[PDB]
């Protein structure tokens, strides 16, 4: 691997469902690359009969200097209209990945708990979901990292 992930911090946690995800990412690039790096955030929800996946946001970073790199990725929140009501207040996953020329080489997975912010709503969840009352809590200190060997240049 030409790129090593050195640190990753969620800056705003817990947060509203509709708040952007702020990831402070520290990495090192060990030699010059021809292309930019593409950071992506993916939502994965699990309902009874299928998963729902959403590409939440992506950003191209480059040209990448050799050595240490650090930035905050502020990723757009999910499109709630694409998520079943029951899944909006469930445990879900987000996957933060980096790719090179379209090839994913690192993936950082997080558990996320979503619940209503009022006792009455938690115990009597309404038929018509009230997204402004949903709070997310990312399990930010226990990242689930996967690395993949890729072709670089």
């Amino acid at each position: 691997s030409i790129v090593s992930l050195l640190g990753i911090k969620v800056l705003n946690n817990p947060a509203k469902f509709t708040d952007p995800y702020e990831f402070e990412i520290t990495f090192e690039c060990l030699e010059s690359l021809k292309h930019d790096l593409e950071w992506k955030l993916t939502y994965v929800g699990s309902s009874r009969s299928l998963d729902h996946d959403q590409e939440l946001d992506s950003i191209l970073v480059g040209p990448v200097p050799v050595g240490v790199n650090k930035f905050v990725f502020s990723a757009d929140p999910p499109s709630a209209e694409l998520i079943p009501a029951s899944e909006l207040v469930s445990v879900t996953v987000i996957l933060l990945s980096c790719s090179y020329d379209g090839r994913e080489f690192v993936r950082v997975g997080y558990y996320v708990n979503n619940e209503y912010d009022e006792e009455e709503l938690r115990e009597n969840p309404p038929a018509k979901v009230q997204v402004d009352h949903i709070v997310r809590n990312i399990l930010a200190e226990k990242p689930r990292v996967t690395r993949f060997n890729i072709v670089w240049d």
Partner: antibody
Framework: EVQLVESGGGLVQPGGSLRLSCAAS????????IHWVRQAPGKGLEWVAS????????SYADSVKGRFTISADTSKNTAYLQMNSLRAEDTAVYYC??????????WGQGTLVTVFN | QMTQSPSSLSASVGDRVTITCRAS??????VAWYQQKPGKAPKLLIY???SLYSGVPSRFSGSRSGTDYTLTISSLQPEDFATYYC?????????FGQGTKVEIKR
């Protein structure tokens, strides 16, 4: 050439302690989660403890919480399991394994811990 | 948090075999399947419910329905008689199923 090599297993009496080590080869422990999973003869796999990268945060099985501590020394590229207050029921082969997302990809060959009166 | 059955089954080479585990949650990322043979460490087959691990034969597959997770071997080969374990990597705890030993008929 990824390898995890456990050591430190041996005979110990109840109430005693042991420190297991897991020496990583072919990879840097700072980039991965590391896990201990044990198995008694003829029995199933039982997860013991996990440590996560970047934070060094930890998780423990209820059966070992308060007695065992998992840690890592990234400069030595080694993970550890400090086992205090050992009980007869802790006898098992102890595997160290590397995290692969939510799964475990490379497992060591195991070190035997034998608690005896 | 994770229950596996049965503890054993008997089958023949060429048979389609399925093993199911019931998890406490439906999160697909959390479940993996392992193979273990006597005297050896476990080997990863499937991760995140349905992803085939590098180098594992295509006859192994994983699926999910609700909180039920299934390992399928499309056609047992002679080297597939072994014990199979599911794993749930949960919010707080990792739980392994009790294991299913696949034995050979005669």
């Amino acid at each position: 050439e990824v390898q995890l090599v456990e050591s430190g297993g041996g005979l110990v009496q109840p109430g005693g302690s042991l420190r297991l080590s897991c020496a990583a080869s072919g990879f840097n422990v700072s980039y991965y989660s590391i896990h201990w999973v044990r198995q008694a003869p003829g029995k199933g796999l039982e997860w013991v403890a996990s440590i996560y990268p970047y934070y060094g945060s930890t998780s423990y099985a209820d059966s070992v919480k308060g007695r065992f501590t998992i840690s890592a020394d990234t400069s030595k590229n080694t993970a550890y399991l400090q086992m205090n207050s050992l009980r007869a029921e802790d006898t098992a082969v102890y595997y160290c394994a590397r995290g692969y997302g939510w799964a475990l990809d490379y497992w060591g060959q195991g070190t035997l811990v034998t608690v005896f009166n | 948090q994770m229950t596996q059955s049965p503890s054993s089954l008997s089958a023949s080479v060429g048979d389609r075999v399925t093993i199911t585990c019931r998890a406490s949650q439906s999160v697909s990322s959390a479940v993996a399947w392992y193979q273990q043979k006597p005297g050896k460490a476990p080997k990863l087959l499937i991760y995140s419910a349905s992803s085939l691990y590098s180098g594992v034969p295509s006859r192994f597959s994983g699926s999910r329905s609700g909180t039920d997770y299934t390992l399928t071997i499309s056609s047992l080969q002679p080297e597939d008689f072994a014990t199979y374990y599911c794993q749930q990597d949960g919010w707080s705890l990792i739980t392994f199923g009790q294991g299913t030993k696949v034995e050979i008929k005669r």
